[PDB]
Amino acid sequence: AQMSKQLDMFKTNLEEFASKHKQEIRKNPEFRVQFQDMCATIGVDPLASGKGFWSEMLGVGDFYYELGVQIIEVCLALKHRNGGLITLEELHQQVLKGRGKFAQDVSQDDLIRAIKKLKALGTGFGIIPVGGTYLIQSVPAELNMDHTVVLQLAEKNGYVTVSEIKASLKWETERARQVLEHLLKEGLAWLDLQAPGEAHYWLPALFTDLYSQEITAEE
């Protein structure tokens, strides 16, 4: 039991640590990040397991593991409008709307934390950097780096246009049109033949409407 001696040592240090600093981690966002960011320097993961000590005493497990279920459900309830793509904004707005009298306790950073763990359930979730926020993908699609880049271009107006694809990305016409085709085949874009200049491809994931989300609450 060469290692087990120092094991029980740590147990009682942390428990005290918990007893006077419980609700702080639960009360202010800025403090969570601190605790977390130091853990990854050490080579420990407080969120890895429910049998983790960190989770057992601090409750960071049941907070985040629960945040994942909520993130899954919001995305599903929404997947029919938007195709399996949601902005981190709208996700946030919705997770809160469904948390109740505790409708502030979660930050954008918390959401992203949780999705990263969700990735371990296998292909499913994905985080996509755009301009100054993140898009979250919740249904599978393929590697096409070409698909990311267009998403990123779409982000500035909620739509995209072949002429715009070619000029901004310096791409061949077939290549632009091909990715467009994928956006249509997946339900992430809808075509618009009444737009100034030429056809526009609009993504419901972008496009602000702040309403409803019921009928699809049945998963």
Binding site: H80, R81, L184, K185, G187, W190, L191, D192, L193, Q194, A195, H200, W202, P204, F207, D209, Y211, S212
Partner: protein
Amino acid sequence: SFEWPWQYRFPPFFTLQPNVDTRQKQLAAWCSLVLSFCRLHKQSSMTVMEAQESPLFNNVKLQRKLPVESIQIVLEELRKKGNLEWLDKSKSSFLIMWRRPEEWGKLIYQWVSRSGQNNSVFTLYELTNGEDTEDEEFHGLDEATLLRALQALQQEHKAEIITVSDGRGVKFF
């Protein structure tokens, strides 16, 4: 107080989408909207020309309108779903019934049956506008939808449409 749906404010909604899973979705949304726009404006009768210009198929502010071919498509969807009947020899003016006559005649039958009035006569007027009804769903139901209703109820085995006092009648079985 009817609200417009998120689709109505989304430019693409106004174009027949080529992807087939999206189109099914587009069209379920158009159908749901026509029915609920009529239900709200209490209209049961319009024309293709008459409709083509409503704020139903024309978002003036968004600067998009649903083309004629595409509306002929949604009208045909409703027709086969049972909500729309053409009433002019050449496909031009139509009856629009926000609830299906089948569900109608059923509700009406239920009301008749849990009334202690199971074997007796009603004028068309009494059912839609009477004192006895008031608190039912079919109060204020336009004459035509009421006919289809009883005409479906006849075609089953539950009602015969008569001729009564000095008017249009119906006996319930």
